[PDB]
Write a protein that binds this DNA or RNA. Structure first.
Length: 316
DNA sequence: GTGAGGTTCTCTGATGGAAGCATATCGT
DNA sequence: ACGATATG
RNA sequence: GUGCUGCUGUCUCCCAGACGGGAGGCAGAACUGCACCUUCCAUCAGAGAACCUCAC
């Protein structure tokens, strides 16, 4: 259940503008790098309209520029990674249930991501059993730690073991263009994965061109979440307006939204479940009351004007 | 002076896709 | 109890 | 804030012209009047303008 609106902001500082204009280039690099790992020549649609054909040579050169010295040898593994990121694996046993989860092995030198099992079913039953007559070796002598290694050595989702294969070869940590923190990288990679997933669903529907992200031509949402998908934000009201401030690494960025007749007489309260409860009336004639929990807003620059897309959740 | 048959620009409509986070443990 | 990754 | 309409605003176009009216484009807003889930992508059908030749 979703319901969206749009609030205009006219005094965005330099920090948010640079964050919006710097998230796009990381997204574009993610799109081109995933296509490079895919190692399948494709068609690129430029801004003015031109379906150029890009072959394996430029793909290999781009991969070399990304740190993959000899993509010919690791071709059995780069491709095996990309299909995992673009959700081309089995619907069950996804190596990355959310695509943005992948940018910790790809773009973090000291990460140690692959050796985790605390959320693996099997370590949940044994730990709930320490503190054979139940429905599901290691039950004797207890030690769920050992079951962790038993379930990490085997039961490895394809593309996650493949990702760990390259890190020993010193080629997988890829130098992205800008030094975005984990959260903004995850937001950008979520957007890029969404755009390439749509592209591939269209390419297999046809059987064909790729449009890269642009700050003005084909904008994407620089999304701000409350659980690590993007930089955090907090919403409130002051009179008849919206007070939206985000928590960028350069500090807090506060912003006052010009009044909206869609959101009139606003009352806002923070919730203990990572959300903000807001009330409003639709103005016009009937002032029917609505309750909305907001958890993740978006930012889009259209016609030179900055708009936050307030995507809230209403009562069903 | 129109009809007919081809490019070359601005648009609008319909049917597809990707979407708008939950939990979990560990170290302080 | 709260923040830092990790991943359902 | 967004399609619709609305200068207390602007620019431009056309018809009578020295009374006005009829096209469009922005600024809107601090002016109502009906409503408002939306962003991006790729296809396919349809409608408009104009462009070139050859025929009647």
């Amino acid at each position: 259940s979703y319901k969206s609106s749009r609030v205009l902001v006219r005094d965005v500082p330099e920090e948010l503008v640079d964050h919006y204009e710097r998230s796009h280039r990381v997204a574009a690099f993610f799109m081109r790098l995933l296509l490079a790992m895919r190692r399948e020549p494709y068609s690129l649609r430029m801004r003015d309209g031109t379906e150029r054909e890009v072959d394996l040579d430029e793909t290999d050169d781009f991969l070399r520029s990304a740190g993959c010295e000899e993509p010919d040898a690791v071709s059995d593994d780069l491709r095996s990674f990309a299909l995992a990121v673009l959700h081309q694996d089995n619907p069950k046993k996804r190596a990355f249930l959310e695509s943005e989860n992948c940018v910790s092995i790809l773009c973090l030198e000291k990460s140690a991501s692959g050796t985790r099992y605390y959320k693996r079913p099997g370590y949940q039953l044994l730990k709930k059993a320490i503190e054979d007559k139940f429905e599901a070796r290691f039950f004797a002598a207890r030690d769920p730690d050992d079951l962790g290694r038993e379930l990490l050595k085997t039961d490895t989702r394809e593309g996650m073991a493949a990702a760990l294969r390259l890190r020993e070869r010193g080629v997988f940590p890829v130098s992205v263009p800008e030094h975005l923190d984990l959260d903004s990288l995850k937001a950008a990679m979520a957007s890029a994965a969404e755009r390439l997933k749509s592209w591939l669903a269209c390419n297999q529907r046809a059987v064909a061109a790729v449009t890269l992200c642009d700050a003005d031509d084909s904008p994407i949402k620089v999304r701000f979440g409350l659980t690590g998908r993007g930089r955090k934000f907090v919403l409130s009201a002051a009179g008849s307006r919206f007070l939206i401030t985000v928590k960028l690494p350069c500090g807090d960025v506060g912003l006052t939204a010009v009044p909206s007749r869609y959101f009139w007489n606003p009352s806002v309260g923070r919730t203990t479940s990572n959300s903000f409860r807001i009330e409003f009336t639709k103005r016009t004639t009937e002032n029917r009351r609505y309750v909305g929990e907001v958890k993740e807003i978006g930012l889009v620059r259209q016609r030179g004007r900055y708009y936050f897309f307030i995507d809230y959740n209403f009562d069903p």
